[PDB]
């Protein structure tokens, strides 16, 4: 449905600024589970839900690429 597209891009924007291309999966996981708390409050629970649903594929893609639009597209969050 694309219901998570906008929050996915916001969340990956956070990750981009708090991770390097170098980061381990453990570091990426730690950032993912911190990130929702830094988004504007209206997005918090939606972001938590997004992360829980997509966490495995997010970790696998984020070691390859960190572009918000591209990440969110490839994982299916932005049907586009």
The residues, any chain, with a CB within 8 Å of residue 26's CB and separated by 6 or more, are none
Domain ranges of the chain: 1-80
Token digits of residue 15: 């990750």
Taking alpha carbons only, the member of 80, 25, 20 closest to residue 55 is 25
Which resolution in angstroms does this entry have?
Answer: 2.0
Token digits of residue 34: 């911190």
User: 53 with 1: CB under 8 angstroms?
Assistant: no
Q: Which CATH superfamily is domain 1-80 in?
A: Saposin-like (1.10.225.10)
């Amino acid at each position: 449905d694309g219901g998570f597209c906008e929050v996915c891009k916001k969340l990956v924007g956070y990750l981009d600024r708090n991770l390097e291309k170098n980061s381990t999966k453990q570091e990426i996981l730690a950032a993912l589970e911190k990130g929702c708390s830094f988004l504007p409050d209206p997005y918090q629970k939606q972001c938590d839900q997004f992360v829980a649903e997509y966490e495995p594929v997010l970790i696998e893609i984020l070691v390859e690429v960190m572009d918000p639009s591209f990440v969110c597209l490839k994982i299916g969050a932005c049907p586009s």
